[PDB]
Enzyme design. Structure first.
Site, PDB file in Angstrom:
ATOM      1  N   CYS A 132     -47.476 -14.726 -32.675  1.00 55.53           N
ATOM      2  CA  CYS A 132     -48.934 -14.439 -32.602  1.00 55.53           C
ATOM      3  C   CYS A 132     -49.477 -14.391 -31.952  1.00 55.53           C
ATOM      4  O   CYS A 132     -49.582 -14.260 -31.244  1.00 55.53           O
ATOM      5  CB  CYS A 132     -48.244 -15.141 -34.541  1.00 55.53           C
ATOM      6  SG  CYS A 132     -49.565 -16.159 -34.453  1.00 55.53           S
ATOM      7  N   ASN A 183     -51.546 -18.561 -32.449  1.00 57.88           N
ATOM      8  CA  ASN A 183     -50.258 -19.231 -32.722  1.00 57.88           C
ATOM      9  C   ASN A 183     -50.911 -20.623 -33.765  1.00 57.88           C
ATOM     10  O   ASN A 183     -50.143 -22.355 -32.803  1.00 57.88           O
ATOM     11  CB  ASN A 183     -49.807 -19.485 -30.724  1.00 57.88           C
ATOM     12  CG  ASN A 183     -49.220 -20.903 -30.789  1.00 57.88           C
ATOM     13  OD1 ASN A 183     -48.459 -21.786 -29.959  1.00 57.88           O
ATOM     14  ND2 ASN A 183     -48.117 -20.140 -31.212  1.00 57.88           N
ATOM     15  N   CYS A 210     -51.301 -20.129 -36.857  1.00 56.21           N
ATOM     16  CA  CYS A 210     -50.936 -19.877 -38.200  1.00 56.21           C
ATOM     17  C   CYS A 210     -48.957 -19.583 -38.892  1.00 56.21           C
ATOM     18  O   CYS A 210     -48.218 -20.030 -38.937  1.00 56.21           O
ATOM     19  CB  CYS A 210     -51.751 -18.834 -38.901  1.00 56.21           C
ATOM     20  SG  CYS A 210     -53.825 -19.556 -39.593  1.00 56.21           S
ATOM     21  N   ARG A 211     -48.988 -17.975 -38.266  1.00 50.82           N
ATOM     22  CA  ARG A 211     -47.648 -17.752 -38.847  1.00 50.82           C
ATOM     23  C   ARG A 211     -46.914 -17.981 -37.449  1.00 50.82           C
ATOM     24  O   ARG A 211     -45.927 -18.369 -37.931  1.00 50.82           O
ATOM     25  CB  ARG A 211     -47.817 -15.565 -38.454  1.00 50.82           C
ATOM     26  CG  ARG A 211     -48.268 -15.334 -39.844  1.00 50.82           C
ATOM     27  CD  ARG A 211     -49.090 -13.760 -39.028  1.00 50.82           C
ATOM     28  NE  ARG A 211     -49.238 -13.596 -38.451  1.00 50.82           N
ATOM     29  CZ  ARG A 211     -50.015 -12.508 -37.402  1.00 50.82           C
ATOM     30  NH1 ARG A 211     -48.999 -11.149 -37.940  1.00 50.82           N
ATOM     31  NH2 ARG A 211     -50.898 -12.070 -36.682  1.00 50.82           N
ATOM     32  N   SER A 212     -46.855 -17.536 -36.101  1.00 52.80           N
ATOM     33  CA  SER A 212     -45.876 -18.002 -35.304  1.00 52.80           C
ATOM     34  C   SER A 212     -45.221 -20.221 -35.381  1.00 52.80           C
ATOM     35  O   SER A 212     -44.232 -20.245 -35.563  1.00 52.80           O
ATOM     36  CB  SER A 212     -45.801 -18.117 -33.654  1.00 52.80           C
ATOM     37  OG  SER A 212     -47.463 -18.913 -33.080  1.00 52.80           O
ATOM     38  N   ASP A 250     -51.094 -12.171 -41.890  1.00 53.93           N
ATOM     39  CA  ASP A 250     -51.910 -13.637 -41.148  1.00 53.93           C
ATOM     40  C   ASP A 250     -52.858 -13.613 -42.399  1.00 53.93           C
ATOM     41  O   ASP A 250     -53.500 -12.507 -43.065  1.00 53.93           O
ATOM     42  CB  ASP A 250     -52.743 -12.758 -40.036  1.00 53.93           C
ATOM     43  CG  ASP A 250     -53.375 -14.123 -39.338  1.00 53.93           C
ATOM     44  OD1 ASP A 250     -53.829 -15.108 -39.791  1.00 53.93           O
ATOM     45  OD2 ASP A 250     -54.968 -13.605 -39.309  1.00 53.93           O
TER      46      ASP A 250
HETATM   47 CL   LIG Z   1     -52.793 -14.498 -35.535  1.00 53.58          CL
END
Ligand SMILES: [Cl-]
Length: 156
Positions: A8, A11, A13-15, A123
């Site tokens: 993402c 690194n 939140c999402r990933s 996000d």
């Molecule tokens: Cl992000």
């Protein structure tokens, strides 16, 4: 050892959420020693930071691990057997970086309900806890296809 990495922008939140979730799921399947799972961000504004408190919160709320150290995409990540992009922006950046199309796939392309057009994972950073719970659900719905991908690869 097969290597899958989620990507993402920050690194945080999402990933990392996708990373902890998929890694734990593989452990339950007894495939933790056969597959290495990591994550990184295209940017470097968070290198060394833990996952966003809200990301760890939702992970924990669902029984998943939260330990994390943010990192920017590097040699190690570009050498993974599969680079999983959280959104279309991440995919084009990894593509333009030199990773061939077959090794760059959007997470949601693995959702069993996915069409030829893969959807982005939004996000949640500027959202509320509800947005983080939604990101969790979206990721949760997409991972089953990644397990199939792993099964195909391990056969090799
Ligand atoms: Cl992000």
């Amino acid at each position: 050892p097969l290597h899958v990495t989620f990507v993402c922008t920050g690194n945080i939140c999402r990933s990392p959420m996708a990373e902890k979730m998929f890694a734990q799921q593989l452990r339950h399947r007894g495939l933790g020693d056969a597959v290495r799972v990591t994550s990184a961000g295209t940017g470097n504004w968070h290198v060394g930071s833990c996952a966003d408190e809200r990301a760890a919160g939702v992970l924990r709320a669902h029984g998943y691990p939260t330990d994390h150290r943010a990192a920017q995409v590097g040699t190690e990540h570009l050498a993974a057997d599969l680079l999983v992009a959280l959104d279309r922006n991440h995919a084009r950046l990894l593509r333009q970086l030199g990773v061939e199309a077959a090794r760059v796939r959007m997470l949601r392309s693995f959702d069993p309900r996915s069409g030829t057009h893969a959807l982005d994972v939004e996000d949640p950073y500027y959202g509320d806890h509800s947005d983080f719970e939604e990101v969790f659900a979206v990721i949760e719905s997409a991972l089953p296809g990644l397990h199939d991908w792993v099964d195909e690869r391990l056969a090799r």
